[PDB]
Design a protein around this ligand. Structure first.
Ligand code: ZJJ
Ligand code: ZN
Length: 198
Protein backbone atom coordinates (compact mmCIF):
# COMPACT_ATOMS: atom_id res chain seq x y z
CA UNK A 1 0.00 0.00 0.00
CA UNK A 2 1.04 3.62 -0.53
CA UNK A 3 1.00 4.55 3.16
CA UNK A 4 3.38 1.66 3.97
CA UNK A 5 5.95 2.11 1.19
CA UNK A 6 9.41 2.24 2.78
CA UNK A 7 12.58 4.17 1.96
CA UNK A 8 15.97 2.70 1.20
CA UNK A 9 18.57 4.06 3.59
CA UNK A 10 21.61 6.15 2.79
CA UNK A 11 25.10 4.86 2.12
CA UNK A 12 27.11 5.25 5.32
CA UNK A 13 30.84 5.72 5.87
CA UNK A 14 31.92 3.04 8.35
CA UNK A 15 35.69 3.29 8.02
CA UNK A 16 38.64 4.28 5.88
CA UNK A 17 41.87 2.95 4.42
CA UNK A 18 44.75 4.82 6.03
CA UNK A 19 47.45 5.60 3.46
CA UNK A 20 48.95 8.49 5.44
CA UNK A 21 52.15 6.89 6.73
CA UNK A 22 54.50 4.09 5.72
CA UNK A 23 52.00 1.26 6.33
CA UNK A 24 48.49 0.89 4.93
CA UNK A 25 45.77 -0.36 7.25
CA UNK A 26 41.99 -0.26 7.49
CA UNK A 27 40.26 1.64 10.29
CA UNK A 28 36.64 1.18 11.29
CA UNK A 29 34.90 4.35 12.49
CA UNK A 30 31.36 3.06 13.07
CA UNK A 31 29.87 -0.28 14.08
CA UNK A 32 26.95 -2.11 12.53
CA UNK A 33 24.34 -0.82 14.99
CA UNK A 34 25.35 2.80 14.46
CA UNK A 35 25.60 2.12 10.73
CA UNK A 36 22.01 0.86 10.62
CA UNK A 37 20.79 3.88 12.58
CA UNK A 38 22.82 6.29 10.45
CA UNK A 39 21.54 4.74 7.22
CA UNK A 40 17.93 5.31 8.31
CA UNK A 41 18.32 8.94 9.38
CA UNK A 42 20.98 9.90 6.86
CA UNK A 43 22.54 12.00 9.62
CA UNK A 44 26.25 11.25 10.15
CA UNK A 45 28.19 13.53 12.50
CA UNK A 46 31.39 11.47 12.38
CA UNK A 47 34.56 13.20 11.22
CA UNK A 48 35.78 12.02 7.81
CA UNK A 49 39.44 11.62 6.86
CA UNK A 50 41.47 10.21 4.00
CA UNK A 51 41.02 9.30 0.36
CA UNK A 52 39.43 5.83 0.51
CA UNK A 53 36.28 5.33 2.58
CA UNK A 54 34.72 2.04 3.57
CA UNK A 55 30.97 2.34 2.99
CA UNK A 56 27.96 0.20 3.76
CA UNK A 57 24.25 -0.07 3.12
CA UNK A 58 21.84 -2.22 5.10
CA UNK A 59 22.88 -5.23 3.01
CA UNK A 60 26.24 -4.54 1.29
CA UNK A 61 29.68 -3.13 2.05
CA UNK A 62 32.20 -1.75 -0.43
CA UNK A 63 34.57 1.20 -0.92
CA UNK A 64 34.35 4.83 -2.04
CA UNK A 65 37.21 6.96 -3.37
CA UNK A 66 37.54 10.75 -3.47
CA UNK A 67 38.96 12.16 -6.71
CA UNK A 68 38.88 15.91 -7.47
CA UNK A 69 36.30 16.68 -4.83
CA UNK A 70 33.90 13.85 -5.70
CA UNK A 71 33.45 10.67 -3.65
CA UNK A 72 33.10 7.96 -6.31
CA UNK A 73 31.78 4.41 -5.95
CA UNK A 74 29.99 1.70 -7.96
CA UNK A 75 26.32 1.70 -8.90
CA UNK A 76 25.98 -2.01 -8.10
CA UNK A 77 26.79 -1.14 -4.49
CA UNK A 78 25.17 2.25 -3.97
CA UNK A 79 22.34 2.23 -6.50
CA UNK A 80 20.72 5.68 -6.57
CA UNK A 81 21.08 6.04 -2.80
CA UNK A 82 21.93 9.18 -0.88
CA UNK A 83 24.98 9.25 1.38
CA UNK A 84 24.67 10.17 5.05
CA UNK A 85 26.31 13.43 6.09
CA UNK A 86 26.34 15.88 9.02
CA UNK A 87 23.40 17.83 7.51
CA UNK A 88 21.38 14.81 6.39
CA UNK A 89 21.17 12.68 3.24
CA UNK A 90 23.07 14.03 0.24
CA UNK A 91 21.80 13.25 -3.26
CA UNK A 92 24.15 11.79 -5.83
CA UNK A 93 25.95 14.35 -7.97
CA UNK A 94 26.66 11.79 -10.69
CA UNK A 95 24.84 8.59 -11.68
CA UNK A 96 25.81 6.41 -14.66
CA UNK A 97 24.51 2.84 -14.70
CA UNK A 98 26.23 2.24 -18.05
CA UNK A 99 29.62 2.66 -16.36
CA UNK A 100 28.50 1.25 -12.98
CA UNK A 101 29.48 4.62 -11.50
CA UNK A 102 27.99 7.05 -9.00
CA UNK A 103 29.34 10.05 -7.15
CA UNK A 104 28.55 12.48 -4.34
CA UNK A 105 30.19 15.72 -3.28
CA UNK A 106 33.25 14.69 -1.28
CA UNK A 107 32.58 14.94 2.49
CA UNK A 108 34.16 17.80 4.40
CA UNK A 109 37.44 16.52 5.80
CA UNK A 110 38.15 13.98 3.08
CA UNK A 111 41.27 14.22 0.93
CA UNK A 112 40.99 13.85 -2.84
CA UNK A 113 43.34 11.94 -5.11
CA UNK A 114 44.44 13.73 -8.26
CA UNK A 115 43.86 12.03 -11.64
CA UNK A 116 46.93 10.34 -13.07
CA UNK A 117 48.69 12.03 -15.98
CA UNK A 118 51.76 9.76 -16.02
CA UNK A 119 50.40 7.26 -18.54
CA UNK A 120 52.11 4.51 -16.56
CA UNK A 121 50.95 0.89 -16.82
CA UNK A 122 52.36 -0.20 -13.42
CA UNK A 123 49.35 0.13 -11.12
CA UNK A 124 48.44 -0.66 -7.52
CA UNK A 125 44.98 -1.71 -6.32
CA UNK A 126 43.92 -0.82 -2.77
CA UNK A 127 41.48 -3.25 -1.14
CA UNK A 128 39.15 -2.86 1.83
CA UNK A 129 41.71 -4.80 3.90
CA UNK A 130 44.42 -2.25 3.00
CA UNK A 131 46.23 -4.71 0.74
CA UNK A 132 48.13 -2.90 -2.03
CA UNK A 133 48.06 -5.29 -4.98
CA UNK A 134 50.40 -4.75 -7.96
CA UNK A 135 48.40 -4.71 -11.20
CA UNK A 136 49.76 -4.41 -14.74
CA UNK A 137 47.49 -2.34 -16.95
CA UNK A 138 46.32 -4.40 -19.93
CA UNK A 139 43.83 -2.00 -21.56
CA UNK A 140 41.75 1.10 -21.05
CA UNK A 141 39.74 -0.69 -18.35
CA UNK A 142 41.66 -3.91 -17.59
CA UNK A 143 44.62 -4.87 -15.44
CA UNK A 144 46.18 -8.19 -14.50
CA UNK A 145 47.10 -9.21 -10.98
CA UNK A 146 50.83 -9.90 -10.74
CA UNK A 147 50.03 -12.49 -8.04
CA UNK A 148 46.57 -14.05 -8.60
CA UNK A 149 44.29 -14.53 -5.57
CA UNK A 150 40.89 -16.10 -4.84
CA UNK A 151 38.09 -13.67 -5.64
CA UNK A 152 37.24 -13.76 -1.93
CA UNK A 153 40.16 -11.40 -1.32
CA UNK A 154 38.72 -8.82 -3.74
CA UNK A 155 35.05 -9.05 -2.72
CA UNK A 156 33.90 -5.83 -1.09
CA UNK A 157 36.63 -3.67 -2.66
CA UNK A 158 34.62 -2.29 -5.58
CA UNK A 159 34.85 1.48 -5.51
CA UNK A 160 38.47 1.40 -4.38
CA UNK A 161 41.31 2.98 -6.31
CA UNK A 162 43.85 1.82 -8.81
CA UNK A 163 46.89 4.05 -8.33
CA UNK A 164 49.97 4.82 -10.42
CA UNK A 165 53.51 4.76 -8.96
CA UNK A 166 53.15 8.45 -8.07
CA UNK A 167 49.97 7.86 -6.06
CA UNK A 168 47.58 9.31 -8.65
CA UNK A 169 44.10 7.90 -9.29
CA UNK A 170 44.11 5.70 -12.40
CA UNK A 171 40.66 4.17 -12.01
CA UNK A 172 37.89 2.84 -9.79
CA UNK A 173 37.75 -0.92 -9.18
CA UNK A 174 34.57 -2.29 -10.75
CA UNK A 175 34.69 -6.05 -11.36
CA UNK A 176 36.95 -9.10 -11.07
CA UNK A 177 37.86 -11.44 -13.93
CA UNK A 178 38.20 -14.95 -12.54
CA UNK A 179 38.33 -18.57 -13.69
CA UNK A 180 37.83 -21.36 -11.14
CA UNK A 181 37.40 -18.76 -8.41
CA UNK A 182 40.94 -17.38 -8.84
CA UNK A 183 41.11 -13.69 -9.76
CA UNK A 184 43.53 -13.15 -12.65
CA UNK A 185 42.51 -9.66 -13.80
CA UNK A 186 40.42 -6.65 -12.78
CA UNK A 187 37.95 -4.43 -14.63
CA UNK A 188 37.96 -0.78 -13.60
CA UNK A 189 36.41 2.56 -14.48
CA UNK A 190 39.25 4.64 -15.99
CA UNK A 191 39.83 8.01 -14.37
CA UNK A 192 39.25 9.63 -17.77
CA UNK A 193 35.63 8.45 -17.69
CA UNK A 194 35.36 10.27 -14.37
CA UNK A 195 37.03 13.41 -15.75
CA UNK A 196 34.64 13.25 -18.70
CA UNK A 197 31.58 12.90 -16.47
CA UNK A 198 32.82 15.89 -14.47
C1 ZJJ B 1 22.61 -3.18 -10.99
O1 ZJJ B 1 23.18 -2.14 -11.75
C2 ZJJ B 1 24.43 -2.45 -12.32
C3 ZJJ B 1 24.97 -1.60 -13.47
C4 ZJJ B 1 26.33 -1.92 -14.09
C5 ZJJ B 1 27.15 -3.14 -13.56
N1 ZJJ B 1 28.47 -3.47 -14.15
C6 ZJJ B 1 29.23 -4.59 -13.65
C7 ZJJ B 1 30.59 -4.93 -14.27
C8 ZJJ B 1 28.67 -5.44 -12.49
O2 ZJJ B 1 29.40 -6.54 -12.00
C9 ZJJ B 1 28.79 -7.14 -10.83
C10 ZJJ B 1 29.13 -6.64 -9.68
C11 ZJJ B 1 30.67 -6.83 -9.72
C12 ZJJ B 1 31.46 -7.09 -8.59
O3 ZJJ B 1 31.26 -8.01 -7.87
N2 ZJJ B 1 32.59 -6.19 -8.37
C13 ZJJ B 1 33.60 -6.36 -7.29
C14 ZJJ B 1 33.06 -6.24 -5.86
O4 ZJJ B 1 33.79 -6.34 -4.93
N3 ZJJ B 1 31.67 -5.95 -5.60
S1 ZJJ B 1 31.19 -5.80 -3.97
O5 ZJJ B 1 31.93 -4.74 -3.30
O6 ZJJ B 1 31.52 -7.01 -3.21
C15 ZJJ B 1 29.37 -5.55 -3.91
C16 ZJJ B 1 28.43 -6.57 -4.55
C17 ZJJ B 1 28.92 -4.09 -3.99
C18 ZJJ B 1 28.83 -4.85 -2.66
C19 ZJJ B 1 35.12 -6.22 -7.23
C20 ZJJ B 1 34.49 -7.61 -7.32
C21 ZJJ B 1 35.12 -8.67 -6.38
C22 ZJJ B 1 34.73 -9.95 -6.44
C23 ZJJ B 1 33.64 -10.38 -7.44
C24 ZJJ B 1 33.64 -11.91 -7.63
C25 ZJJ B 1 32.26 -12.43 -8.11
C26 ZJJ B 1 31.62 -11.48 -9.19
C27 ZJJ B 1 32.48 -11.49 -10.50
C28 ZJJ B 1 31.99 -10.42 -11.48
N4 ZJJ B 1 32.83 -10.41 -12.65
C29 ZJJ B 1 32.45 -9.60 -13.82
O7 ZJJ B 1 31.34 -9.19 -13.93
O8 ZJJ B 1 33.43 -9.35 -14.82
C30 ZJJ B 1 32.96 -8.90 -16.00
C31 ZJJ B 1 32.93 -7.39 -16.11
C32 ZJJ B 1 33.79 -7.47 -17.35
F1 ZJJ B 1 34.92 -6.71 -17.27
F2 ZJJ B 1 33.07 -7.29 -18.50
C33 ZJJ B 1 34.04 -8.94 -17.07
C34 ZJJ B 1 32.06 -9.03 -10.79
O9 ZJJ B 1 33.10 -8.55 -10.46
N5 ZJJ B 1 30.80 -8.25 -10.52
C35 ZJJ B 1 29.51 -8.66 -10.77
N6 ZJJ B 1 27.39 -5.10 -11.92
C36 ZJJ B 1 26.60 -3.97 -12.44
C37 ZJJ B 1 25.22 -3.64 -11.80
ZN1 ZN C 1 50.36 9.06 -12.54
Amino acid sequence: HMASMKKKGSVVIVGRINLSGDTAYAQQTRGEEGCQETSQTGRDKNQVEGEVQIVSTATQTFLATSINGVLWTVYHGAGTRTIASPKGPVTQMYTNVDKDLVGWQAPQGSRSLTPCTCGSSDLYLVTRHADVIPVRRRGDSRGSLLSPRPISYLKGSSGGPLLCPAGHAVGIFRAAVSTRGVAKAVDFIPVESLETTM
